[PDB]
Write a protein that binds this ligand. Sequence first.
Ligand SMILES: NC(=O)c1ccc[n+]([C@@H]2O[C@H](COP(=O)([O-])OP(=O)(O)OC[C@H]3O[C@@H](n4cnc5c(N)ncnc54)[C@H](O)[C@@H]3O)[C@@H](O)[C@H]2O)c1
Ligand SMILES: CC1(C)CCC(Cc2cc(O)c(-c3ccccc3)c(=O)[nH]2)CC1
Length: 268
Amino acid sequence: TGLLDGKRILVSGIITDSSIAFHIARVAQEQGAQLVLTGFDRLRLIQRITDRLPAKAPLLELDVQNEEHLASLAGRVTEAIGAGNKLDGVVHSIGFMPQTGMGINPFFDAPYADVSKGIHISAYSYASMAKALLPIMNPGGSIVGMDFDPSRAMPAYNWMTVAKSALESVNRFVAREAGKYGVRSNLVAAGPIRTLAMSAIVGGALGEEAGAQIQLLEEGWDQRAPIGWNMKDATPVAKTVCALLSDWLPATTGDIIYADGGAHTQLL
Ligand SMILES: NC(=O)c1ccc[n+]([C@@H]2O[C@H](COP(=O)([O-])OP(=O)(O)OC[C@H]3O[C@@H](n4cnc5c(N)ncnc54)[C@H](O)[C@@H]3O)[C@@H](O)[C@H]2O)c1
Ligand SMILES: CC1(C)CCC(Cc2cc(O)c(-c3ccccc3)c(=O)[nH]2)CC1
């Protein structure tokens, strides 16, 4: 028997087969969960991607900045799962920052208008999704969001670090709301993952020093992690997410779970 047998789970922000969301999806189904997937904007591409998943599952459209999408969602989900049916889990794997708040671009020259859009999509949306979907969520349910450890600062990550810092604060407040419905809210702080965009950056595309800064990070991370860190293997992150969506961490809300091979616990 699977781990999430007959749980119903919403899963956001799939865009490629290297997206973490995709691997969460994959493992989720492997355990036997019925999924509902949202996508943003290029629904047509995302449709092609989601077809490679163990089982097919409904694709709804959701731009977290679109107010109506948020409004209409609560229903659109219940539609695709059948009325008198509730969700046992939502997964937030959304994030965005303009290239002024990330990469080689100096920290100071990011115009607030840029930064804000970032925080809107990367941290605010977490409460948005939780507001939309809490109503239709079963007791013992789970909310899970994607996070990169922002408690220290580092090169390149710039304003996104702030967005992540924001996000960990939002999460603790959602935890409060979620509690009313008997729902948990947590974040998975993950080590770096070799996604499409990340490898592109390791090839002039975000700069030259940028490629060198990514590489430095990735390598220190593996060296610090007492059980190592394979940037290419996104499975153990997904596995972790699924453990939070399971019934096996029932006493753990408002919190951060570290899938980083233990890096953040080691100085050198
Ligand atoms: N990249 C990493 O190594 C890493 C590490 C830890 C945490 N994270 C976090 O995990 C999440 C996903 O990372 P990823 O590597 O899968 O990147 P990704 O680009 O594959 O996923 C981000 C998703 O957000 C979606 N998105 C963008 N703007 C949106 C909007 N306005 N409304 C709704 N959706 C929108 C995109 O369609 C995309 O599918 C992000 O929250 C990211 O910060 C990433
Ligand atoms: C610190 C460093 C130079 C920059 C990125 C990090 C990890 C990381 C987190 C992160 O949230 C993202 C991200 C940003 C926007 C949209 C989707 C994903 C990322 O690409 N990489 C790995 C290296």
